[PDB]
Structure formats: structure tokens, C-alpha cells
Amino acid sequence: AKEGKIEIFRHILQREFSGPYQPLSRKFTEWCYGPVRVSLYDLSSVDSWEKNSVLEIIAFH
Amino acid sequence: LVENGADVHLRACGRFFQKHQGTCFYFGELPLSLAACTKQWDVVTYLLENPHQPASLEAT
């Protein structure tokens, strides 16, 4: 996030995998119904109760 | 399901408060409309003609 590399930043932000490697993921599809694709994202990039978060780094540093 | 089961005129979202539905996918709140919207030609063909519970195409 800090160095400006976006291509790997996006992939790390949306990492799903399948099979035995489920825990190595940050985006879990909950259920799918037609075009609707409700999913759950992981938050290691939230400012709340987390000093030096990704949001601050993108915004300020 | 159709052979010995529920009627076809069964509203999907139903209820009286339209702003509360289980999913934001609006298809018509009917099995026939759901089959038509999803390009299930065989399913709609079966639904229109079946000697257990015909589905009225003008159902509101």
C-alpha cells in the first residue's frame, strides 16, 4: 500500500483459494443467488482500534 | 415437487412490506417469472403444460 504497488495489493486484498487452503484467505463467499454474490471480506485494514492502518497509509503516508 | 407438492401461484417475496425482502434480486416474485427470467426454457415449458397444476400466464 505504501510503495504504490497496486497489482499485488489488490490480489492480497481479494484472496480466496479453495480446498485444503481455506484458512489462507481473506474473501469468503457466503451464498450466491443469481446475480447476487453476497460475500464477506476480512478487515486487517480498518482504522478502528488499529494504529497505522492501510487507510491511513494510503491517505497520509 | 410439482407432481405431488405446492401450487405454482406462490409469491416469492410475498408479505405486505415490499421494502423488506430476503435478497435485492427482483425477478417477479413468482416461480414462473423466476424460470422465465433465468432462461429456463424447459422449466417454463413444463410449468405451462403439466396435468397436475397448470400455471396461468396472466397471473399477477
Give the whole-angstrom CA distance, residue A32 versus residue A37: 5
Give the whole-angstrom CA distance, residue B56 versus residue B60: 9
Q: B23 contacts in A (CB within 8 Å)? A: 33, 36
Gyration radius from chain B CA atoms: 12
B1 touches chain A (CB under 8 A): no
Amino acid at residue number B52: H
- Window 16-45 of A: residues touching B by CB (8 A cutoff) are 33-36
A59 touches chain B (CB under 8 A): no
Gyration radius from chain A CA atoms: 14
Burial class (CB in 10 A: 0-12, 13-18, 19+), A53: middle
Q: How many helices (H) and strands (E) does chain B have?
A: 2, 0
Residue written as grid cell 423466476: B34
Give the whole-angstrom CA distance, residue A61 versus residue A52: 10
Joined grid coordinates for residue B47? 410449468
B45 phi and psi angles, rounded to 5 deg: -60, -45
Instruction: Give the count of beta carbons closer than 10 Å to the beta carbon of residue A27.
Output: 13
Joined grid coordinates for residue B58? 396472466
- Method of determination? cryo-EM
